[PDB]
């Protein structure tokens, strides 16, 4: 029995609609546990409540496992809903004003993504030569449009659109709140945040993980993903 943990929505649908049957064909049973937050899944994995989770990108994982002393590691990538800047009280990028508010996730690896996006938009200017994966407020050279960044817990970002001019929303929460990726005013161009599964390091060589990895890389899964998850960013290894 393989116990998966995912965030609600797209990553759990992948298990229930495609992966689970592929693994049952090989004699496994599958249990899915879903989470509404980003903090519990790696802790449940490390404590043995999960065998594998699918919810995070590698910058998040690298930071989280180091901070909390978790002996876990990434395995394979999965199709991922991209990060986007979405309309809030203002409906178009050209409407940005001096002092416009932008809501952003408050954890460091996802906050960096917002600063890189704001620099790409020309709303702020980051210093030269920084590490984009750890971009922080100290790396801002000039806040060109005096953007006020409103930092929130990531799950709160869809609801923040009533309170801020623009909202930068993680794809999993955008999808699960009924937002459409095509409604974004600007989508992150990077592929560094295509999400990874994670397991306890002790399990990296297990036969069950080999079978899970094959399930997420099958022709059938790719065909399903391309239809069910249009506009998602693909694993690098799919070589699309
Ligand atoms: C926990 S890392 C952030 C969530 C991830 N699904 C993303 O690519 O936005």
Numbering used by the authors: 44 to 283
The authors write:
A sample of unfolded/refolded MetQ was then mixed with 10 mM d‐methionine prior to the crystallization. Six molecules are present in the asymmetric unit of the d‐methionine bound MetQ crystal. This observation is consistent at all six MetQ molecules present in the asymmetric unit. The α‐amino and α‐carboxyl groups of both l‐ and d‐methionine interact with residues R156, N213, and N238 located on one domain of MetQ, while from the other lobe, residues Y81, F98, H100, and Y103 pack around the methionine thioether group. Short contacts to the methionine CB group are observed in both structures, with ∼3.3 å distances observed to the Y98 CO in the l‐methionine structure, and to the Y81 OH groups in the d‐methionine structure. The side chains of l‐ and d‐methionine adopt distinct rotameric conformations for the N‐Cα‐Cβ‐Cγ; Cα‐Cβ‐Cγ‐Sδ; and Cβ‐Cγ‐Sδ‐Cε torsion angles, which are approximately −175°, −175°, and −70° for l‐methionine and +170°, −80°, and −60° for d‐methionine; the latter values correspond to −170°, +80°, and + 60°, respectively, for l‐methionine. Consequently, while there are differences in the details of the binding interactions between l‐ and d‐methionine to NmMetQ, a qualitative evaluation does not identify any obvious feature as dominating the differences in binding affinities for these two ligands.
The bacterial periplasmic methionine‐binding protein MetQ is involved in the import of methionine by the cognate MetNI methionine ATP binding cassette (ABC) transporter. MetQ, the substrate‐binding protein (SBP) for MetNI,5, 6 is proposed to play a dual role in transport by either binding l‐methionine for delivery to the translocation pathway of MetNI, or by facilitating d‐methionine uptake through the ligand‐free form when complexed to the transporter. Structural studies of SBPs in their ligand‐bound and ligand‐free forms have revealed a hinge‐bending or “Venus‐flytrap” mechanism where two domains of SBPs adopt their open conformation with an accessible binding site in the absence of substrate; substrate binding stabilizes the closed conformation, where the two domains come together and sequester the substrate.
